[PDB]
């Protein structure tokens, strides 16, 4: 496959060799093909051109001239009569389609996740007991979400309303945003191992050291692959892929699911020993509910469709994959936030309070 | 793979196909008027 610049650039070294370049009937075809002549008084059967990008090349054009060498001209006072009707029987509506219903199954599962979200960290932030280092690594997450929905937004009313700078800055900007979210999943999985597995911890040193992690880490993916497009291709947007570089942003966002997924599958272990050290059908209830919860957080539902490379759009796999990943990850924040902001007993009690005080008072 | 990004790519094919598309029918059309 070939772009509109290669097409571009091809008509006009199509259109260059035409300068370089009954009766013959002399070149009486058109002004963008490049086959000038009319062949002797006979029907041109010159191929369908193999320059332009599908065009069945197979076929044929089958221009003709007649009487001994004259056009065939003005039906109904037309001119320069041709015959490649047939040749441009060829080539997306279902495309645009299925494209149109992921976008807006998405932009509302985005939407009621920042105002969930959002009123997530308000709830957070405002109350002074809820802050903890547990909490503020939540703020963190919950955060990276919404930089993530509100970007995503903000590529698509660029991309949807020519390498200008600020299409340039959107999508790099939504690649880190997605990148920082991703990694702070990665964050509160590994807090949690580290909370787990380990007797001691130091607040000072390590909350610092994730955040670190979770912010600049992103973000020299992100300018180490913007420094390699803009010295190696630096074509138009970079909504195109140039090619296997995408792999340097792809594979470390990857390379942290499956490490979370076995966090997430570790933690689960300790779960069922424990209960089993305390005791039956309460004890697979438990911890059926407990795994539910967790789910979200983790991320686990990535590793369904992690390892599978670029599938053609026309197909099941690829319909399926969009369908889920576009459903789960735009309310996996809404989830979040509900599973531990709103129903948090913390915040459920400290809310209760905090309404009851201001009533007494009212 | 990243699915975003896979979605991504697949709207940039996608819109500049179109552009091209759309570019050989007014070409078709101009060659029609000839």
């Known amino acids: ?362 | 793979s990243v699915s975003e990004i896979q979605l991504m790519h697949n709207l940039g094919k996608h819109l500049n196909s179109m552009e091209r598309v759309e570019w050989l029918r007014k070409k078709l059309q101009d060659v029609h008027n000839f």
């Open chain 1, 1 to 362: 496959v070939m772009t509109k610049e290669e097409q571009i650039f091809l008509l006009h070294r199509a259109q260059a060799q035409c300068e370089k370049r009954g009766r013959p009937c002399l070149p009486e075809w058109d002004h963008i093909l490049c086959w000038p002549l009319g062949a002797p008084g006979e029907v041109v059967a010159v191929p369908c051109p193999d320059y332009i990008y599908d065009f069945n090349h197979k076929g044929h054009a089958y221009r003709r001239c007649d009487r001994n060498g004259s056009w065939e001209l003005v039906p109904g006072h037309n001119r320069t009569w041709a015959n490649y009707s047939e040749c441009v029987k060829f080539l997306e509506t279902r495309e645009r389609e299925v494209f149109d219903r992921l976008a807006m199954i998405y932009t509302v599962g985005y939407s009621v996740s920042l105002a969930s979200l959002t009123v997530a960290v308000l709830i957070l932030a405002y109350f002074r007991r809820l802050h903890c280092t547990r909490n503020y690594i939540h703020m963190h997450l919950f955060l990276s979400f919404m930089l993530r929905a509100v970007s995503i937004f903000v590529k698509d009313a660029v991309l949807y309303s020519a390498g200008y700078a600020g299409c340039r800055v959107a999508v790099t900007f939504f690649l880190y945003f997605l990148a920082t979210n991703y990694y702070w999943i990665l964050v509160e999985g590994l807090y949690l191992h580290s909370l787990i597995f380990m007797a001691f911890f130091s607040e000072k040193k390590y909350l610092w050291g994730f955040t670190v992690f979770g912010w600049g880490l992103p973000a020299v993916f992100v300018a180490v692959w913007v420094s390699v497009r803009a010295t190696l291709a630096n074509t138009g947007c970079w909504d195109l892929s140039s090619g296997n570089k995408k792999w340097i942003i792809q594979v470390p966002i990857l390379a942290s699911i499956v490490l979370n997924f076995i966090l997430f599958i570790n933690i689960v272990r300790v779960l069922a020993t424990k209960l089993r050290e305390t005791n039956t059908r309460q004890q697979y209830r438990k911890l059926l509910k407990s795994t539910l919860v967790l789910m979200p957080l983790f991320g686990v539902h990535y590793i369904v469709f992690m390892a599978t490379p670029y599938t053609e759009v026309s197909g099941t796999l690829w319909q399926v994959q969009m369908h889920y990943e576009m459903l789960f990850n735009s309310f996996q924040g809404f989830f979040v936030a509900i599973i531990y902001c709103f129903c948090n007993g913390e915040v459920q009690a400290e809310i209760k309070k905090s309404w009851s005080r201001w009533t007494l008072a009212l």
